[PDB]
Amino acid sequence: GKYFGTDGVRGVANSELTPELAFKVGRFGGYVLTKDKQRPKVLIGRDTRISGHMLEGALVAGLLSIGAEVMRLGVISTPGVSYLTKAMDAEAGVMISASHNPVQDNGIKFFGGDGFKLSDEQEAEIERLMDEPEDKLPRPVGADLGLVNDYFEGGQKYLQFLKQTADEDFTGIHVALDCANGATSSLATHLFADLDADVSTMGTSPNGLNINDGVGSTHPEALSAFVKEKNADLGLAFDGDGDRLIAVDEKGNIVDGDQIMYICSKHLKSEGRLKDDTVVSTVMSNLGFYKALEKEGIKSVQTAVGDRYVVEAMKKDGYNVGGEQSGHLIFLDYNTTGDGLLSAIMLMNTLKATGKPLSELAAEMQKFPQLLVNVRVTDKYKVEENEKVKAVISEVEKEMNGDGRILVRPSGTEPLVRVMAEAKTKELCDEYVNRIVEVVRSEMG
Amino acid sequence: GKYFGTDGVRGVANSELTPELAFKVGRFGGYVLTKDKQRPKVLIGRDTRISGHMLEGALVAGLLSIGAEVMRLGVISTPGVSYLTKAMDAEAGVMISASHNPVQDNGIKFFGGDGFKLSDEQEAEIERLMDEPEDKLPRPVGADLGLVNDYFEGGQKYLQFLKQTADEDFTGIHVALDCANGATSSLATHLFADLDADVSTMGTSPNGLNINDGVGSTHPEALSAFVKEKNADLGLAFDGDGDRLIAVDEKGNIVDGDQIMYICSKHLKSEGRLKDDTVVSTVMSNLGFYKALEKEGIKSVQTAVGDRYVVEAMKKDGYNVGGEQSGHLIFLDYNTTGDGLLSAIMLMNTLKATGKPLSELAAEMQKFPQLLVNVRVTDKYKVEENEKVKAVISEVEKEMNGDGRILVRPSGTEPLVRVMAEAKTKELCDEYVNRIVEVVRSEMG
């Protein structure tokens, strides 16, 4: 009915995301991808979550009961699953994980031959079957049955590829890594050490219970302190599945996905590699990202939140680069989903080639301050129109005239409305927001 | 209701023995064995059957959804599973296989802590649960979930143990091996080669479709020809799971489980190791086995067909050795189920120590000829009594007076009765059987 959301199937493993269901998934989904040849070739990959194994076995059982030849990969980032499912011309690819969420949660994700999430048509049918109450799909027996050749060497192919996209070894750089105790634990540390960089690690020590546990892109303050401690040049914080990246500069400060997009797209434009010198990004990006983009003559396209949209955009118009503030950047020259380590290597290429420190590079793009004030109200949904509100906003919008931005939306969870303001400084934020907030409390209370 | 038969659960994999059911098994059975500690320790092992993997994954999924720490072993004979489940003090042990059957079939088998099939009480409850239609067993989540550490090194521990029970290396012996393309493929050939024996192989080349395919204990004629071809001293034919053994002498002839029991128990008695110098065996054994046993002053106990009974017997009365004509011999000094390779090493110990060739040793025990004649009849079940039949038999029984044996039983499959006769020679068989057969056709036709 509705198993496949944004990020595939998710639940708390065993309770909601039962192995029964991870069976039905691989069984039916392997049927759907079976329409080509009698013997599809799914490959499957997972992070360090303890539920990993339980799901991987039930999923592979499903796949094998409908003839699919199956290639376990072991622990590997979602990037590497997509890269390999393309490079090995495999009918599909699967990733058991639930990036950056806590360990108890997990999820199944699918990739097609091309390295892209499955067509909404396909997922459609997978769900069609998963609600019939008769498993009338074929049951091959004897020699028709699925086959299963492990391929734990997959990892070092996706390593072998990342290693070629580094414009020279990184000698002379001290990098700290925090790998969320996840799929990137063993991949990253081999990579940057095989690229001749002084690596200092942390969060690289998974036990299947510690993924994303005060480490990783979502919790970068540990890494913030570790950089200063080990006095490194920068810190990289991947998340659970190796699909995001948040950096940290020698000064200890955080370097979100807008600043990484800025930094990298700018370097890329200096090699002629930025395609039509444009960059896709989402609403969520910070006004000062668009400002410093103009300043470097890089144009931009905005899309709605979520990388199905940011990738929908780069596809048609053939764009080279696109990203989110989350740290989720796509370099389509190289791979078809967000790739933490790719991001990180592009960032290091920048650093090496410019001899600047990460603080300097990220200072070109100046973030605008934000401000949120939430006011409790009687009837939060009647703010869509108002004889005052609706007006106030518009005036302040024009008063700002490109140097600012306002956003007022009612909450779901509660009975209050959220006023929010980008401005060039903290005191303009304060002025503007207070204005709107006043004409709201006039109505409600 | 009735899933656990003699040899565990069996079916044709996927069609009857579905992965769904191999899930319910490990889930419920891991509950039943969970009553001790919150974190049982099942270990699991399989043969080369292609359905192996599919079942192993669904089974491990079950086990993990109820907290069991689980130890994959890979491919290993059922012997080695039992040996290890004892030596590692593990709550249970599991073997996915269906020995000597064709590849399409498979099966789940259970062993307790002690190395013995599970108590009929336990299997009882496993089935109790498997027919409730509500999976109300706990669903641990987060850190309670199952854990899974592979242990593919298990194999070479059970090797390390077999290698100690060989009374000296086997230098100077040429042995041919036929391992049914099964679990014993890699174990045997390392073993006898690490014991310094000239090994010539066959059936050692599994691809998950060729198990028991004109090789192995059930189909020994290939091996019969191979021994003569490679002019070896003897041939060993294990079956799919490494639980049986049939030998073949340098002359090419077959050496069934009665002759191996004779040969080995006799050697053992010569080391004082045969306990109370007795040997357990089943009805199925050949009169001349009992004769040559008397001749060497070894006493004997008979039990009904099947090793649950042959082991029930050695348990109470503390017997050292017991076997079946199948090749399924138990040496309880050393292990708790039938052990093909153990048998084989005991046989080689005999050979080495006596310097005799296998033909000579197996000639001490002289088999009596058998004869079967099946007569079609009108009402095959009224032969339990007869005014002629019942008499004829009894007379011929006493006429034989210990030198013979008769057995007449009606068939199920068809409408006819089966007359059968052991005698000292082929022409006594012919006489005796013809007598009975005559007084049967008198009635029926």
Cβ atoms of residues B317 and B301 within 8 Å: yes
Cβ pairs bridging A and B (under 8 Å): 110
Burial of B198-212, coded b for 16+ CB within 10 Å and e otherwise, reads bbbbbbbebebbbbb
Do the Cβ atoms of B23 and A61 come within 8 Å? Answer: yes
- Return the closest-CA partner of residue B345 out of B263, B254, B281, B228: B263
Measure B278 CA to nearest chain A CA, in Å: 43
A87, A157 contact by CB (below 8 A)? yes
Using CA atoms, how far apart are residues A425 and A428, in angstroms rounded to an integer? 5
Amino acid at A170: F
Which residue of chain A comes nearest to B21, CA vs CA?
Answer: A20
Task: Give the residue on B whose Cα is nearest the Cα of A51.
Answer: B145
CB contact under 8 A, A61 and B19: yes
* Residue of chain B minimizing CA distance to A19: B61
Q: What is the 3-state composition of chain A as percent helix, strand, coil, each rounded to the nearest 5?
A: 40, 20, 40
Residue of B nearest to A208 (CA): B143
User: Which chain A residues are closer than 8 Å to B60 by Cβ?
Assistant: 53-54, 57
Q: Catalytic pick from B99, B224, B265, B285?
A: B99
Name the experiment that determined this structure: X-ray
Q: Report which residue type is found at B34.
A: T
What string of DSSP letters covers B139-157?
---GGGS-EE---TTHHHH
Pull the structure tokens for residue B2.
């009735």
Per-residue tokens: A153:
């060497």
How far is it, in rounded angstroms, from Cα A66 to Cα A24? 11
Select from B44, B55, B137, B141 the residue whose CB has the most chain A CBs within 10 Å, as the one to mutate to test that interface: B141
Q: Which chain B residues contact residue A140 at CB under 8 A?
A: 14
* A413 to A305, A408, A418, B16: CA distances (angstroms): 20, 15, 12, 50
Beta-carbon contacts of residue A268 (< 8 Å; ≥ 6 apart): A274, A320, A321, A346
Q: Which of A15, A65, A103, A152 has the most B C-beta neighbours within 10 Å, making it the best mutation to test the interface with B?
A: A65
**How close A385 gets to chain B, by Cα (Å)?**
46
Query: What residues of chain B lie within 8 A of the CB of A51, using their CB?
Result: 145
Q: Residue A301, exposed/middle/buried by CB under 10 A (0-12, 13-18, 19+)?
A: middle
For the beta carbon of residue A132, count every other beta carbon within 10 angstroms. Answer: 10
Catalytic residue selected from A51, A65, A99, A265: A99
Q: Is B54 in Cβ contact with A145 (below 8 Å)?
A: yes
The answer to whether B166 and B348 are in contact (CB under 8 A) is: yes
Confirm whether residue B150 is marked as ligand binding.
no
Chain A partners within 8 Å of B141 (Cβ): 12-15, 104
Q: 3-state secondary structure string, A296-337?
A: CCCEEEEECCCHHHHHHHHHHHCCCEEECCCCCEEECCCCCC
Is B403 labeled as ligand-binding?
A: no
| Element (DSSP H or E) covering residue B392 | helix B389-400
All residues of chain A having their beta carbon less than 8 Å from the beta carbon of residue B147 are 50, 208
Bridge partners (DSSP) of residue A279 are A300
Question: What gap in Å lies between CA B375 and CA B445, rounded to an integer?
Answer: 8
Closest chain A residue to the Cα of B147, Cα to Cα: A50
Residue B99 annotated to the active site? yes
Record the tokens describing residue A143, joined without a space: 């020699």
Burial of B58 (0-12, 13-18, 19+ CB in 10 A): buried
- Does the distance separating the beta carbons of A15 and B20 come in below 8 Å? no
Q: Quick check: B298 and B274 in contact, CB under 8 A?
A: yes
Per-residue tokens: B389: 């039949």
Q: Which of B22, B103, B145 sits opposite A51 (nearest CB)?
A: B145
Long-range contacts of B124-127 (CB under 8 A, 24+ apart): B125/B32, B126/B3, B126/B4, B126/B25, B126/B28, B126/B29, B126/B32, B127/B1, B127/B2, B127/B3, B127/B4
Read out DSSP for A182-251? Answer: STHHHHHHHHHHHTT-EEE--S----SS-TTSS-STTSTHHHHHHHHHTT-SEEEE--TTS---EEEETT
First to last CA, chain A: 41
- Number of C-alpha atoms within 13 angstroms, CB side, residue A385? 1
Q: How far is A64 from chain B (nearest CA, A)?
A: 6
Chain position carrying tokens 């907290």: B67
* Cβ proximity of A362 and A249 under 8 Å: yes
Chain A residue whose CA is closest to B64: A54
Asked if A55's CB is within 8 angstroms of B145's CB, the reply is no
- Who among B53, B140, B209 is closest to A143 (CB)? B209
* A241 marked as part of a ligand binding site: yes
CB contact under 8 A, B141 and A104: yes
Task: For residues A285 and A422, give the distance between their C-alpha atoms in angstroms, rounded to a whole number.
Answer: 11
- Mutation for testing the A interface, residue in B24, B28, B54 having most A CBs under 10 Å: B54
Contact A139 B18 (CB under 8 A): yes
Q: Would strands B174-178 and B147-148 be described as parallel, antiparallel, or unpaired?
A: unpaired
DSSP state of A277: G
Q: Give residue A377's Cα distance to chain centre.
A: 35
Q: Please report residues of A whose CB lies closer than 8 A to that of B137.
A: none
Mutate to test the interface with B, among A10, A54, A137 (most CBs of B within 10 A): A54
How far is A336 from A243, CA to CA, in rounded Å? 11
| Alpha-carbon gap, residue A53 to A58, rounded angstroms | 9
DSSP code per residue over B171-205: TT-EEEEE-TTSTHHHHHHHHHHHTT-EEE--S--
For residue A7, what are the contacts with CB-CB under 8 A and spacing of at least 6? A98, A99, A107, A109
Stated as kind and residue range, the H or E segment containing B329 is: strand B329-331
Among B281, B357, B294, B366, residue whose Cα is nearest residue B325: B281
C-alpha angle B137-B138-B142 in degrees, rounded to nearest 5: 150
Residue A188 token pair:
């990253």
Write the residue in B13, B65, B143 that is nearest to A19 by C-beta: B65
- Chain A's closest residue to B24, CA to CA, is A20
Going by the DSSP 8-state scheme, the letter that residue B16 receives in this structure is T
Contact B331, B72 (CB under 8 A): no
B241 marked among binding-site residues: yes
With CB atoms and an 8 Å threshold, state whether B58 touches A61.
yes
Rounded CA Rg of chain B: 24
Considering only CB atoms, B142 lies closest to which of A56, A103, A145, namely A103
Whole-Å CA distances, B293 to A176, A360, B34, B345, B349:
76, 94, 45, 21, 19
Interface residues on B facing A, Cβ-Cβ cutoff 8 A: 12-15, 18-20, 22-23, 50-51, 53-58, 60-62, 64-65, 103-104, 139-143, 145-148, 208-209
